[PDB]
Amino acid sequence: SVNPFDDEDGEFYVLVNDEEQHSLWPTFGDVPDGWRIVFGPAGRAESVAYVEENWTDMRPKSLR
Amino acid sequence: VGTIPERFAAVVAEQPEAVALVAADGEESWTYGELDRWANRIAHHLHARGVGRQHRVALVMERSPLLVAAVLGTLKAGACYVPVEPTWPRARIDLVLADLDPALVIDERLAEEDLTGYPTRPLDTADVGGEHLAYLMYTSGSTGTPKGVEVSHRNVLSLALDPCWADADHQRVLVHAPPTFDASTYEMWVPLLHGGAAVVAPPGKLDAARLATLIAERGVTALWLPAGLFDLITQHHPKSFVQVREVWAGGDVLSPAAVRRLVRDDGTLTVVNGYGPTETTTFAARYRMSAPARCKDPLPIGEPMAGSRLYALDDRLRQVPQGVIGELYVGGDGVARGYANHPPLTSERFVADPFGRPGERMYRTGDLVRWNHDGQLEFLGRVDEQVKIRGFRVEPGEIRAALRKRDGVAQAVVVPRTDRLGERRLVAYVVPEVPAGADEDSTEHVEKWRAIYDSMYDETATEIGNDFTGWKSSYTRDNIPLSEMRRWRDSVVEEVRGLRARRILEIGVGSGLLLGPLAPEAEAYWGTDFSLPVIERLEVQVGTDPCLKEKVSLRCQHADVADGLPVKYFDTVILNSVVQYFPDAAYLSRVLDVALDRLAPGGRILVGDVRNYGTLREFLTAVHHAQHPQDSASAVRAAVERAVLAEKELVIDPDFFTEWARTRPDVVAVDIRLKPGADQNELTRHRYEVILHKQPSQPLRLADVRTANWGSEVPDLSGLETALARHGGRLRLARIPNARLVSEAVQCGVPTNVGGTPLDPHELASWGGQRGYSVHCTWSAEAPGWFEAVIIPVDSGHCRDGVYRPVGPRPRQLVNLPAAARRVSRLPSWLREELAAELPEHLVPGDIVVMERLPLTTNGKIDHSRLPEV
Ligand SMILES: CC(C)[C@H](N)C(=O)OP(=O)(O)O[C@@H]1O[C@@H](n2cnc3c(N)ncnc32)[C@H](O)[C@@H]1O
Ligand SMILES: Nc1ncnc2c1ncn2[C@@H]1O[C@H](CSCC[C@H](N)C(=O)O)[C@@H](O)[C@H]1O
Ligand SMILES: [Ca+2]
Ligand SMILES: [Ca+2]
Ligand SMILES: [Ca+2]
Ligand SMILES: [Cl-]
Ligand SMILES: [Cl-]
Ligand SMILES: [Cl-]
């Protein structure tokens, strides 16, 4: 099999931290505590495309 | 406290007079107090030049005491230190500095700077916390560019304040690993945060013998050693580790035999198998070897570090049960912030942790692991194509990308190979780029052939058309008998007479082998040839006999050039055993268009003695196994691959002529057939005739004749009589194993492959002749070993179409490229020089092998087993 985070023909969320750090994550899994879904079910390409546009600043809410 | 300066300040507070830093010489040494003040002076100097909080400082420096001071000075200024190897090529250094775009760039010139002016007190600054960056380090990236891992203060403190370091084992530590590699994080901070001494090894590459000296002479108590370099030093210099208490060995899989050399029942020296990627801060797991009983043949990576959390997970992100394989994910406080300037790749690899604290994240290693019976984690290889070479983490895609962007190269694959000695290294297989419409070397390729032919023909007397200079067999290196060469020539003459030729143009006339028998009973016989010595010989020869003096014309010009030749005058253009000396497919296409303009309506181009590309590999394996019968199957395939690329003659697949004929609407018929006769040589076995007729010829359409396979449908020649009766005379027999190639194989000693019961094309024609049929034999598009035979009621109508039938879409490679054969031999050298100027030395592969095509599997993916050995 292939790894679920590199599935390509797979369904994904984009989670975000309390520190606004983004995480790609497959829809079948049990969503972890302290993460909220900002990008509803989608393909990997458009999920990856979301992270480029929306993360931008990678600092973990020290100043940001 | 939650920063490195704050914890370092606690050490200097207790032990200001204790030794902190020792030089490579052994003569100079700095105390904690002296190192603190020295680092403070650098921190003030950095502040003067504009370095503040959350800034990046590039340290383009060799391994030294000044570098240890500089990293402390950088951290004391609230900044983030980024080591850059000064022995890297300037292309790589400028690439990292561009991606980083740092606030400041320190180099060797920091030593020359006068620091005595600045104060020796703390800089104070804005308050730094745990989540602020300590350093950046660059790993190999799969895309092409390198990716910098952003590491924080608490990540370093997670590693550095593990309870395992709370003892006297790291009193004197050797600092020898490169600053760019993250083992340096262990080497610096473990002793510096516990009152120990950092013994700085000298700059550059240090072999096993040179480390063995320093370990013993400096009085080293603790060590990092890569698994490969650990194996060499422990084999040859086991006496060096007498005063050593702890050795942390890892990077690659650790040799159990190597550990057993050092570890004893008393347990004064302990060896630790240290696992961890860069993204989890040096060490994620550890397995301690105190006694030799612990050294197993599996060599487990062991249990987690204090700050680490190890999850063996399946394809659905659930925890795997005991003794079952899963992919390793590393949680805990060692997990890095992410990759610098790559948010999607960070979100891909640094993922949400379902087992740890709510906010926390989990790094995806891509390492296969398993919990054993004893409860220790084992390492079981790797999921993706990542591999380690001489300690360094290498992603093959980084190599592929650098190769792929060069001029004469289309594709590339890079794989590891274990040599006869034992050490792992890289080999890059590359295929060259094939531009349409020739290259600069195309004209130079023709001029070399001209120079060869001029030297052959000039000087070196006889009659017209009866001389065969001497052709040698590729199998034996002996001469081909002149009886076989006469029959070869007479088959071409018979075919021209059969077409009822009157006005002939022979391109590449030569010494006049065809001119002699054909010109006497012809209305006109024109002959072009690019070698002037032959034209002048023939012009003297035809001058003597006045019968063909008025008829014959002899021009000295290239086949490509149409200048001065009659337009729509001739009824046949001969290209017999000349096409092979052309540089490329575009040149062949151009000369055929020229030859087509020569023909009046109804005429034809006769292309004879064409080298078959479909059976080139079976020809060359036969020649090689004949000349070198002792060579193994792998050595043959390696030798044949070179022979294909080094071939100086042009070799054309039959599909070229069908593809050529579709664009040309004037060409109404294409007759492709095998060579006739029972002679057993390379000419008869691997060459063929092509006839291309013009618009008003009216051919026999043999493309849509009802077919039958040899193996399946019609078992034997008795069944053929039955099948020809049912189908009513018209039947084409397919998938017939070519007996000519079977005979070639047994004589040369090749294993080969085909089905049972081969037929000789000549015997099949003779068999058909007895039963009142004409058998038209041709190549099989399905297989090289097979051939097709179209059986029709006998007649003298020399004008056929669609004897050869293509099967499936196969224009992958119609012709080879002899003009580029010299550039192909220069590529292995040239690409090594190109990658050495761009990349670090470990990324440059050992050997670069060229191939005309990458061997693919049946499904589509790359077939690694077929790739030739070096
Ligand atoms: C100080 C450590 C050793 C250093 N941070 C390092 O080599 O990490 P790197 O990012 O270069 O890559 C790692 O190398 C492999 N690996 C590390 N220790 C290993 C060990 N003990 N048995 C097998 N593989 C090991 C892992 O697959 C991982 O990808
Ligand atoms: N690019 C090119 N243009 C014109 N003539 C060429 C050529 N390459 C090779 N030749 C000529 O082609 C000849 C090949 S020898 C074959 C001679 C003759 N066609 C026969 O069937 O016996 C040589 O005499 C050589 O001078
Ligand atoms: Ca210890
Ligand atoms: Ca290394
Ligand atoms: Ca014939
Ligand atoms: Cl000093
Ligand atoms: Cl920061
Ligand atoms: Cl040549």
Residue B320, domain member (yes or no): yes
Q: Could you tell me how many CB contacts below 8 A there are between chain A and chain B?
A: 87
After which residues does chain B show a gap where C to N exceeds 2.5 Å?
460
Mutation target among B131, B143, B348, B384 for the A interface, most CBs of A within 10 A: B348
Query: Are B711 and B787 within one domain?
Result: yes
Determine, yes or no, domain membership for B242. yes
Q: Are residues B693 and B738 in the same domain?
A: no
B448 and B345 together in one domain? no
Q: Quick count: other Cβ atoms within 10 Å of Cβ B826?
A: 11
Contact criterion met (CB < 8 Å) for B338 and A21: yes
Q: Are B602 and B726 part of one and the same domain?
A: no
What is the number of the ligand closest to the CA of B113? Answer: 6
What CATH code is carried by the domain that includes residue B484? 3.40.50.150
Same domain, B245 and B354: yes
Q: Residue for token digits 């993204």?
A: B279
Q: Mind giving me the DSSP string for B646-692?
A: T--S--B-THHHHHHHHH-SS--EEEEEEPPSS--SHHHHHEEEEEE
Say what the alpha-carbon torsion angle B399, B404, B408, B410 is, to the nearest 10 degrees: 130
Residues B256 and B160 in one domain: yes
Strands of the sheet with B147-152, listed across from one edge: B104-107, B56-60, B80-83, B133-139, B147-152, B338-339
Query: Å from A53 to nearest chain B CA?
Result: 10
- Cβ-Cβ contacts under 8 Å, B352 against chain A: 15, 17, 23, 25, 31-32, 35
Closest-CA residue to B433 (of B464, B403, B467, B407): B407
Spell out which residues of chain A touch residue B54, defining contact as CB-CB under 8 Å. 59, 62-63
Backbone φ and ψ for B170, nearest 5 degrees, come out as -105, 45
Are B749 and B742 in contact by the 8 Å Cβ rule? The answer is no
**Three-state SS across B525-574?**
EEEECCCHHHHHHHHHHHHHCCCCCCCEEEECCCCCCCCCCCCCCEEEEE
Question: Do both B657 and B723 map to the same domain?
Answer: no
- Distance CA(A23)–CA(A51), nearest Å, equals 9
Angle formed at CA B170 by CA B166 and CA B173, multiple of 5 degrees = 155
| Enclosing domain of residue B686 | 441-613+651-699
Q: Which of B388, B389, B392, B394 for a ligand 1 pocket mutation test, highest count of atoms within 8 Å of Cβ?
A: B388
Domain assignment present for residue B338? The answer is: yes
Residue at B247: amino acid letter = V
| Helix-helix angle B65-76:B32-48, to 10 degrees | 60
| Residue B510, ligand 2, Cβ within 6 A | yes
Contact criterion met (CB below 8 Å) for B639 and B804: no
Amino acid type, B407: D
3-state secondary structure of B448: helix
A41 min Cα distance to partner chain B (Å):
16
First to last CA, chain B: 57
Tokens, residue B141? 């990236």
Q: Any known ligand binding at B600?
A: no
* CA–CA separation, B168 and B188 (whole Å): 16
Question: Of chain A residues 6-25, which have a CB less than 8 A from chain B?
Answer: 6, 14-15, 17-19, 21-25
Provide the experimental method for this PDB entry. X-ray
* Chain B residues interacting with chain A (CB cutoff of 8 angstroms): 54, 129, 131-132, 150, 315-317, 327, 337-338, 340-341, 343-344, 346-354, 357-361, 364, 366, 383
> Does B162 belong to an annotated binding site?
no
Q: Which among B165, B381, B139 is positioned nearest to B272, based on CA atoms?
A: B165
Q: Resolution for this model in angstroms, one decimal place?
A: 2.9
Residue B708, beta-bridge partner list: B733
Which ligand is the nearest neighbour of the Cα of B290? 3
B167 is known to lie in a ligand binding site: yes
Q: Quick check: B334 and A46 in contact, CB under 8 A?
A: no
CB-side exposure of B120: number of CA atoms within 13 Å? 7
B374's tokens? 């004893």
Asked if residue B478 and residue B337 are part of one domain, the reply reads no
Q: Is B308 helix (H, G, I), strand (E, B) or coil?
A: strand
Considering its fold, how many domains does chain B have in total? 3
- CA neighbor of B432 nearest in space, from B400, B413, B408: B408
| CATH code of the domain covering residue B254 | 3.40.50.12780
What does the alpha-carbon distance between residue B377 and residue B296 come to, in Å, rounded to a whole number?
Answer: 13
Residue B46, φ and ψ in degrees, nearest 5: -65, -40
Can you read off the two tokens belonging to residue B599?
């023909």
Asked if B664 and B706 sit in the same domain, the reply is no
B150 with B247, same domain? yes
d(CA B189, ligand 4 centre) in Å? 18
Q: Do A55 and B359 touch (CB under 8 A)?
A: no
- For a ligand 2 pocket test, name from B442, B448, B453 the mutation site with the most ligand atoms within 8 angstroms of its C-beta: B453
Structural domain boundaries in chain A: 1-64
Across the interface, of B317, B337, B358, the residue whose CB is closest to A34 is B358
Give yes or no for a contact between A28 and B348, defined as CB atoms under 8 angstroms apart: no
Residue B467 in domain:
yes
- Could you tell me the two tokens for B648? 């100086």
Q: What is the DSSP string of B387-415?
A: EEETTEEE-HHHHHHHHHTSTT-SEEEEE
Residues B479 and B366 in one domain: no
Q: Is B828 part of a structural domain of the chain?
A: no
* Tokens standing for residue B794: 């006998």
Assess whether B287 and B361 both reside in one domain.
Answer: yes
- B79 alpha carbon – ligand 7 mean position (Å): 8
To 5 degrees, how large is the angle CA B480–CA B482–CA B487?
A: 105
Cα B262 versus chain centre, distance? 40
CATH of domain A1-64: 3.90.820.10
Q: Which residues of chain A neighbour B346 with C-beta distances below 8 Å?
A: 22, 58
For the Cβ of B508 lying below 6 angstroms from any atom of ligand 2, the answer is: yes
SS3 B352: strand
What does the block give as tokens for B300?
């487990």
Q: Is A62 on the interface with B (CB under 8 A)?
A: yes
Rg over alpha carbons for chain A, rounded to the nearest Å, is: 12
Residue of B504, B529, B574 to test ligand 2 pocket, by largest number of atoms within 8 Å of CB:
B529
Q: How far is CA B192 from CA B32, B67, B185, B629, B772, in A?
A: 9, 14, 11, 65, 99
Buried-exposed string B828-864: b where 16+ CB fall within 10 A, e elsewhere: eebbbebbeebbbebbbbeebbbbbebbeeeeeeeee
The answer to whether B131 contacts A62, with C-beta atoms less than 8 Å apart, is yes
